[PDB]
Amino acid sequence: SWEVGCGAPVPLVKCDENSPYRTITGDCNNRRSPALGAANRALARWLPAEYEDGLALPFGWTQRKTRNGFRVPLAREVSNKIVGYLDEEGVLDQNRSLLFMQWGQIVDHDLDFAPETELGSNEHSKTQCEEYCIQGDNCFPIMFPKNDPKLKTQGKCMPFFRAGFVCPTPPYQSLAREQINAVTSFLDASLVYGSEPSLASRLRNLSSPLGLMAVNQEAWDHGLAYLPFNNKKPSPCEFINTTARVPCFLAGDFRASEQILLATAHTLLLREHNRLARELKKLNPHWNGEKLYQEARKILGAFIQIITFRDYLPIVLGSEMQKWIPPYQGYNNSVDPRISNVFTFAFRFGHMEVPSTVSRLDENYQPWGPEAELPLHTLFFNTWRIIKDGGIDPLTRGLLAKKSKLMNQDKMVTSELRNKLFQPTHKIHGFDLAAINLQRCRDHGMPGYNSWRGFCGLSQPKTLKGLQTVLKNKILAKKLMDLYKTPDNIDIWIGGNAEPMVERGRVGPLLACLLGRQFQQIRDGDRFWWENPGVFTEKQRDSLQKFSFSRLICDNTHITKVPLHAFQANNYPHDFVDCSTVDKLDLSPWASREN
């Protein structure tokens, strides 16, 4: 009868039970079990982990060991045979803007992070793995199958280190291995404010009592703010262009500089905080720095949750929306708010949503310059493109004018992400995001496709033909059986994404359920949900109810014409109205008088 409380958390906890403000670590949300939902804990397990030795070794690790009698297919081969395509034409989503894809990636980073192994700074293990592809300890290489063009020019494999686990980090033994989530489970803008105390401070400008966030001092975007630079030397952002020498941005989440389009959206959120903070000082002169900070931070969290639940989710889940996420009835303390381990693979559906190029537009929304459209792979960790070439304006107009890529059973993930991904650790633009995702399901001990179909109460197909009826595709179904011999071994990631989309949504029956469940759970179990009585005032909520991403753009950039429904496909200029016609956030209900 094993122990029921192990770990390596964030220490000195002590809950206030009276603060009207969230903590940084996510600690103290739930009054009865204070660590539920906090950062640095094991992700949750909706079903028992499935490992080779039933404890920690992933499937595919030991050659002679099968998964249900069959050999698990190489990640990169599942990638080459099923996930890739050449023809980028016709791939776009006719009714989903490029913002549809990008917002998913924030929410996501707001919710979950499974850091890689870390016993290696002054390392020979990063090369012991990089160079001779020897699998061992925390090195779990993605071998290249025969006939992979990459053997000819890259090597024999791709570095892939196992995610971190829970009580220590040095080679564990007891219970089943559990991966850590380095961020808070709640939708609380933890990506703009940091999940650690240690960070949530550095990011602030305590040089003054205005409760603002620290901005950069070396470069400006038309009088508007940029994010502070990161001092750590290595820089991946420096690497992609040693002539420009522009480090990556410093923010609440470490993945901020992954991609020119993700660092930009971060800029908008920082700007909104600093913006909320001065509008507030100007209405409550007596408020101190800590108060402008916490109150502005409580407003931005309300923001992230409203756009996510009101505008985003209804168009992912589509017709499945009301089956999993019922109308809000109040804070349930019996609800486990933790991000489940499978959620982090289920939300990966967004990877099939990333388009092959990224565009920049000028004031009239026409191409901005001679090289306005750029291949997605040149934008990974690219901060110099924002700083020495236009600011974030030309890039936000692209967010609104361009479409997302539509998941397609024959065109899953762009080569830009399948063969030219840049990993912040190593030096080349030659990684495969898809193989990484697949190798990662195994790392996390994920149960096969049919266990989840069973979890969601859906038909578990055990035959080629059965798989054909579920996926409604003979050829896809056929290729799957060939590499997996049984739908029982189909990895949840490619498993859930190969299913056709639901009515008016963007994911299949399986993903909608895994998704819907997790999202019904972080809302009902959040003692600080914006609608939970007493968190804000009846008058405040009336103001918050008017948030819109359009307004966010209007108040934090110099765009003057924006769509009224940013997430759908908007053609310029019919669909574009003037900022004057988009509801402003009335901050009057936040005024305060003492007597």
Ligand X SMILES: *[C@@H]1O[C@H](CO)[C@@H](O[C@@H]2O[C@H](CO)[C@@H](O[C@H]3O[C@H](CO)[C@@H](O)[C@H](O)[C@@H]3O)[C@H](O)[C@H]2NC(C)=O)[C@H](O)[C@H]1NC(C)=O
Ligand Y SMILES: *[C@@H]1O[C@H](CO)[C@@H](O[C@@H]2O[C@H](CO)[C@@H](O)[C@H](O)[C@H]2NC(C)=O)[C@H](O)[C@H]1NC(C)=O
Ligand Z SMILES: *[C@@H]1O[C@H](CO)[C@@H](O[C@@H]2O[C@H](CO)[C@@H](O[C@@H]3O[C@H](CO)[C@@H](O[C@H]4O[C@H](CO)[C@@H](O)[C@H](O)[C@@H]4O)[C@H](O)[C@@H]3O)[C@H](O)[C@H]2NC(C)=O)[C@H](O)[C@H]1NC(C)=O
Q: How many residues sit in the footprint of ligand Y (CB under 6 A)?
A: 13
Angle, to 10 degrees, between the axis of helix 260-281 and the axis of helix 393-401? 110
- State yes or no: 19 annotated in a binding site: no
Q: How far is the CB of 241 from ligand X (least distance, A)?
A: 4
| Annotation says 109 is catalytic | yes
- The verdict on 456 binding ligand X (CB under 6 A) reads no
Query: Which among ligand X, ligand Z, ligand Y, none contacts residue 244 (Cβ within 5 to 8 A by kind)?
Result: ligand X
Residues 583, 511: Cα–Cα separation, whole Å = 34
Please report how many Cα atoms fall inside a 13 Å half-sphere around the Cα of residue 434, on the Cβ side.
28
CA 562 to CA 588: how far, in whole Å? 25
| DSSP per-residue string spanning 113-155 | ---B--S-SS-SHHHHHHTT---BTTB--EEPPTT-HHHHHT-
Write down the least CB distance from residue 105 to ligand HEM, Å: 4
DSSP string, 420-456: -EEPTTSS-EEE-HHHHHHHHHHHTTPPBHHHHHHHT
**Residue from 405, 440, 453, 527 binding ligand HEM (CB under 6 A):** 440
Do residues 179 and 444 lie in contact, with contact meaning Cβ atoms separated by under 8 Å? yes
Question: 568 is in the binding site of which of ligand Y, ligand HEM, Ca ion, none (Cβ under 5 to 8 A by kind)?
Answer: ligand Y
Minimum CB separation of residue 258 from ligand CYN in Å reads: 6
Out of 109, 266, 273, 377, the active site residue is 109
Element (H, E) at 290: helix 289-306
Q: Which of ligand HEM, Ca ion, ligand Z, none does residue 154 bind to, with CB < 5 to 8 Å depending on kind?
A: none
Q: What minimum distance in Å lies between the beta carbon of 567 and ligand Y?
A: 7
Smallest gap from Cβ 574 to ligand HEM, in A, equals: 27
Does residue 231 interact with ligand Z by CB under 6 A?
A: no
Minimum Å gap between C-beta 443 and ligand HEM is 7
- Residue 215 makes contact with ligand Y by CB under 6 A: yes
CB nearer to ligand HEM: pick between 347 and 368: 347
Which among 98-106, 243-251, 276-284, 301-309 is the span making contact with ligand HEM, rule CB under 6 A?
98-106
User: Distance between CA atoms of 425 and 53, rounded to whole angstroms?
Assistant: 30
Site string for ligand X, 379-398 (x = CB under 6 A): -----x---x----------
Secondary structure of 201-236 as H, E, C letters = HHCECCCCCCCCECCCCCCCECCECCCCECCCCCCH
Q: Which of 92, 167, 210, 372 binds ligand Y (CB under 6 A)?
A: 210
- DSSP at 311: I
Is residue 482 a known part of a binding site? Answer: no
Q: Is 562 in the site for ligand Y (CB under 6 A)?
A: no
The residue type found at 208 is S
User: Nearest residue by C-beta to ligand X?
Assistant: 244
199 binds ligand Y (CB under 6 A): no
Count interface residues toward ligand HEM (CB under 6 A).
20
> Does residue 578 contact residue 561 with C-beta atoms inside 8 Å?
yes
Cα dihedral angle (431, 435, 439, 440), rounded to 10 degrees?
80
Q: Among ligand X, ligand CYN, ligand Z, none, what binds residue 255 when CB lies within 5 to 8 Å by partner kind?
A: ligand CYN
Query: Does residue 332 bind ligand Z (CB under 6 A)?
Result: yes
The contact set with ligand CYN (CB under 6 A) reads 105, 255, 258
Interaction of residue 587 with ligand X, rule CB under 6 A: no
Tell me the CB-side half-sphere exposure of residue 227, using CA atoms within 13 A.
32
Q: CB of 562 within 8 A of CB of 551?
A: no
Task: Give, as ranges, the residues between 232 and 251 that touch ligand X (CB under 6 A).
Answer: 241, 243-244
Least separation in angstroms between CB 292 and ligand Y = 11
Q: Which of 15, 219, 335, 374 binds ligand Z (CB under 6 A)?
A: 335
Give the pairing of strands 41-42 and 576-578.
unpaired
Q: Does 33 bind ligand Y (CB under 6 A)?
A: no
Please name which of 299, 367, 336, 363 lies closest in space to residue 540, comparing C-alpha atoms. 299
Q: Is 188 annotated as a binding residue?
A: yes
Structure tokens at 567: 């997430």
Residue whose CB is nearest to ligand Z in the complex, by number: 332
CA angle, 421 then 424 then 425, to 5° = 110
Binding mask 310-349 for ligand HEM (x = CB under 6 A): ----------------------------------x--xx-
Q: Is 266 annotated as a binding residue?
A: no
388 Cβ contact partners less than 8 Å away, ≥ 6 residues apart: 244, 246
Provide the token pair at 412. 């899953």
Strand-strand pairing, 421-422 and 403-405: unpaired
DSSP 180: E
Residues that bind ligand HEM (CB under 6 A): 101, 104-105, 108, 112-114, 258-259, 344, 347-348, 350-351, 353-354, 380, 433, 436, 440
Residues that bind ligand Y (CB under 6 A): 95, 205, 207-208, 210, 212, 214-215, 217, 315, 504, 565, 568
Binding-site residue ranges for heme b: 108, 258, 351
Binding-site residue ranges for Ca(2+): 110, 184, 186, 188, 190
Catalytic annotation, residues:
109
Residues that bind ligand X (CB under 6 A): 241, 243-244, 384, 388
